[PDB]
Design a protein around this ligand. Structure first.
Ligand SMILES: O=P(O)(O)OC[C@H]1O[C@](O)(CO)[C@@H](O)[C@@H]1O
Ligand SMILES: O=P(O)(O)OC[C@H]1O[C@](O)(CO)[C@@H](O)[C@@H]1O
Ligand SMILES: O=P(O)(O)OC[C@H]1O[C@](O)(CO)[C@@H](O)[C@@H]1O
Ligand SMILES: O=P(O)(O)OC[C@H]1O[C@](O)(CO)[C@@H](O)[C@@H]1O
Lengths: 337, 337, 337, 337
């Protein structure tokens, strides 16, 4: 249909819960949440435009000496991305990798929305200005009793909203709850978030794939098989392209468009991959599923584990329900016993 | 005291009610409000950097032909500054000058916080880039029954938060409720509001005054008396300075600092002045009082009238409790009968 | 369907100064210290507007630093300029307010220009948060001599252009040249003082006087037996309004975009006015007479003054041809005995 | 107490190019089309990043505009550049991608430079929202002749500088000159490509190859019987990782700030590579060999190519001295029969 109108309007993130929220007859408590992170999708959004060199220590007021000499900004990100959560007065179990374990919230600033986020999708190789941003997750807190680190030990299948934050050039927060996916391209001129492509649905026939191809030898003859099919497509087909930003997001957000498919299991160096799942190989996985995007580990659906530790890691391979789920009959071609 | 610390923190506006709000054991409903205006203290904040010439029609997507040929942006301001209020789902009586009368809110997006604002402190003479911004007001809706235009007919004395928005260079939202005043200097780099001088208290001994001195002849021998005292300070004193931006804000925000005092009654041309009080000669008046700032009309305390019409206008003279209230014994020197 | 978004042939100051000097093979060295002056102004806007991430607000504590009575933003904003400029080499002589004695740029550079200015005049009135600005002229000199203070000593009728801005609701760099009055507005999207306000000439007999009537008893016989003239135009008709910003910078702005009577008479502390030739008289006033707006001092004029000190208070008095000629005629007639 | 806030002697690109050319009286005309090229890039960052107030998103409707397969941001971003540039006069010759045939700038201007470029290469990969960029070289020519296509036809070993940027997590304008590799980062606070990343040279034998292994069956004998070499370095040790951005621009970036093996071999649709001399080979590759990083094509090199068409696909293959020499040695040895 065609009628893309003129201005006098915007679509923030507040409105998304401010609106849908009451339609669910509630408190607007679920919302006390993500704004603090919305406020973050801009906060660090811009930190990297500067993160490069003469911008951080001194030239920004950085004095909370954290680390040995391998970082500080990263910690500074989450360093306000912590109490900000307390500033919402509704935080329960503030789940964060930065800390060995979470931090159980004080009697006062407590709710029933356990935020489980990665305060940084390993920006590390920030020296190139690649596609990175924020990460998060949450549960409507299943239990009741004095919240210990505990409950952040919950599957995405019983998690109604796990998510990231992509600052490419476009700071665009794709918010999604237990119903669909929706991106909020920000507007700095107005320091305001603005939705853009109303509702997302995972594509079905891609053409680019993601995993690390720099890694031939060590990989397995089951994954190093799905590989063959792209390179050497079998019944007279055309070779799958690829672009590996390296990132989980910057490749698992391409998936949100054109046609990408991450592949990343036990890299042999590591027994499961490189994503500390509970706020790594999950937020994305969840967002795709709502969108009708079949997420998984290759040997297990990413949203269905008994979280055997907070900072536990895991694999994720998702994209085209024909292409990413194609690996079933690849893992199922390599069938020896 | 001295300990002005380093970074890793910010003080928005959300937090002010998100925080104080629960300390009042409520819904966070009062807050669904002003964010939409917070979102505005930035929204138009920047409209004037452009408002000047090659920025508006076409070059911004302006097509909702309002007026004869004397404006459009102004209407465009409030043009989104309207439904934005509906986007909060808690709006009752959206009070706005732009319209002859308010607009009574539909059953759905209704609360118990009647927002009474001036969507524009007569920017008109925008051709100079002077000190202007937003305006507002609100009541915790006293009645109950089907809200007609009605209730926006309420005194500031039974109004717990009337306010403006000053974009000088510094977009700084001084929020205040029934308890004190607090300004939120924005940060565009993060499109985020940031409080600055914790708590305000009206000064007591100024040195600059505001009213229009271009107007000798028509003024009265009671106001054209307070005048004498400044020009010709009596018992061997020094002449009061002045700077009349022209604006109500840009002079009644100076009052918030250094030492100003607006004077502005029936300009004779008009029977009460030029401020359509209920969202003009009031927001400020109220903000000063909390701060221990004695507001008034000269012949009546600005926060105590039976609102004899929505768009009704009125006078306001406030500042130093010795200086602005000095007029009592001036109005009281000119005592004839 | 059709697509429309923005300007793709933008008129950058760089682009008018790169094509305006073509009247006679402009050499291509004017904009040298112009785009090099530029960056400074461009920058200083967010001083008053922003806080970086923390400015004077937070760093040590509320220490009683009463040993001086001048803000610190006054040297970081000055040096910056005195530093961005010398790098284009074109410098010759230097004179400011936030400095002392004539400082120069070695015969290891040098070009042909003598910019006389003030870092960001007003400063203090940014505390009351007014949208103030800054005066700043430049010189194309006649000298084989090594930069003595006697070199800057030239009246307005001998400059190349005068310039200033006002970081108010968008900075607008303003400069006067052989062809007239332009007005460059600033795009923050890219940080750009673009020509979006071409030529500018005011209204012949503008109904708006200008000055702080609070100084009533301080001015000489003219202005006074000249004030009520405007108060109630002897012609019985339209009396003058007043939007006297309060801060000198805009005292010239608003007026310009209109037509009014701004000025400064010799009072008590000012038996020679107070707004220095080299930085008030020759820039803004050179902008003015050249704008087609009469500019005055006291009895004499700015376009003809030679200081003893590069910091010599030369009065100022300006507006529309009729608006000010009336007054110089006031003087004419006020020759008295 | 002490006061600290920012830099007050900033190193503007304008300021390095205004002082770098002093090696021998730089004439002061280099930065002419440089600050005039500048504004364009400076601008184009918010194309991908912003939407003005509305871009392609909202204006008419989702009309099936399938008559073409190239975005519209491709001409507003091009023209803009081809328009900001001609205004400095210094132009000589013009060659792009988003245009056709040699377009020039009349003998009513002209200067000495021939900037060959692409408006914003990548475009499309901004839909998937990747932080892409743009290649754009410039020429200081040898010609008494009237601008024939035969004039641009010069290899890299005959330029004055090559340049590009990547509007990713802050645009960084990058340009190579007689003295080496710099890296100007962009301050949006004032819109400034400043020198905050001085000199830059990579790691000698960088453990990170570069290219889309998805193209496996498409490249010539070298890369292939060269791939597993890096997969498992014959030295048994450290195998190469891969952060192949996916988009050519950063395919040169990240690498640079590290050390890797980026390249492009002649495949099916590319029996002459695909990344044109005048805009891929001579800019970025001139940036490279001059960066101290071996740059290649196929058998021959970029620094020595003469096109039939100003749009002639010249392959590209580059990285660290050891990283690529191994490969040109691969060719050496791969002389075969
Ligand atoms: O090892 P690679 O291929 O460079 O991938 C980068 C990895 O680092 C991270 O940023 C971890 O923080 C992951 O999300 C990501 O998978
Ligand atoms: O008439 P003056 O002195 O210029 O004052 C401007 C007036 O216009 C307004 O902006 C009205 O919108 C008032 O708030 C203000 O008092
Ligand atoms: O009220 P006063 O004493 O005339 O001071 C205001 C004037 O003085 C200044 O401080 C300097 O001229 C300006 O900002 C303004 O023009
Ligand atoms: O996966 P492919 O087919 O090699 O395409 C990606 C490459 O092509 C381009 O589109 C042009 O080189 C670049 O962005 C990138 O280097």
């Amino acid at each position: 249909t065609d009628q893309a109108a003129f201005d006098t309007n915007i679509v923030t993130l507040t409105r998304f819960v401010m609106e849908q929220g009451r339609k669910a007859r509630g408190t607007g408590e679920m919302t006390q949440l993500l704004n603090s992170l919305c406020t973050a999708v801009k906060a660090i959004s811009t930190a990297v435009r500067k993160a490069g060199i003469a911008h951080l220590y001194g030239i920004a007021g950085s004095t909370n000496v954290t680390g040995d000499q391998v970082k500080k900004l990263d910690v500074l990100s989450n360093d306000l991305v912590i109490n900000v959560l307390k500033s919402s007065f509704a935080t329960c179990v503030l789940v964060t990798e930065e800390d060995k374990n979470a931090i159980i919230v004080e009697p006062e600033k407590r709710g029933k929305y356990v935020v489980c986020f990665d305060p940084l999708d390993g920006s590390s190789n920030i020296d190139c200005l690649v596609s990175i941003g924020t990460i998060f997750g949450i549960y409507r807190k299943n239990s009741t009793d004095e919240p210990s680190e505990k409950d952040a030990l919950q599957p995405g299948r019983n998690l109604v909203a796990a998510g990231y934050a992509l600052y490419g050039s476009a700071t665009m927060l794709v918010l999604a709850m237990v119903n669909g996916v929706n991106c909020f391209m920000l507007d700095p001129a107005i320091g305001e978030f603005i939705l853009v492509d109303r509702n997302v649905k995972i594509k079905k026939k891609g053409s680019i794939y993601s995993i690390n191809e720099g890694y031939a030898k060590e990989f397995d003859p089951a994954i190093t098989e799905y590989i063959q099919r792209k390179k050497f497509p079998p019944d007279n087909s055309a070779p799958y392209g690829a672009a590996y930003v390296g990132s989980m997001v910057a490749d698992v957000h391409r998936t949100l468009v054109y046609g990408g498919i991450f592949m990343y299991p036990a890299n042999k160096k590591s027994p499961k991959g490189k994503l500390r799942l509970l706020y790594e190989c999950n937020p994305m996985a969840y967002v795709m599923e709502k969108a009708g995007g079949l997420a998984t580990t290759g040997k297990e659906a990413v949203l269905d584990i008994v979280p055997t530790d907070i900072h536990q890691r895991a694999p994720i391979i998702l994209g085209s329900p024909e292409d990413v789920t194609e690996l079933l009959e690849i893992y199922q071609k390599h069938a020896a016993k």
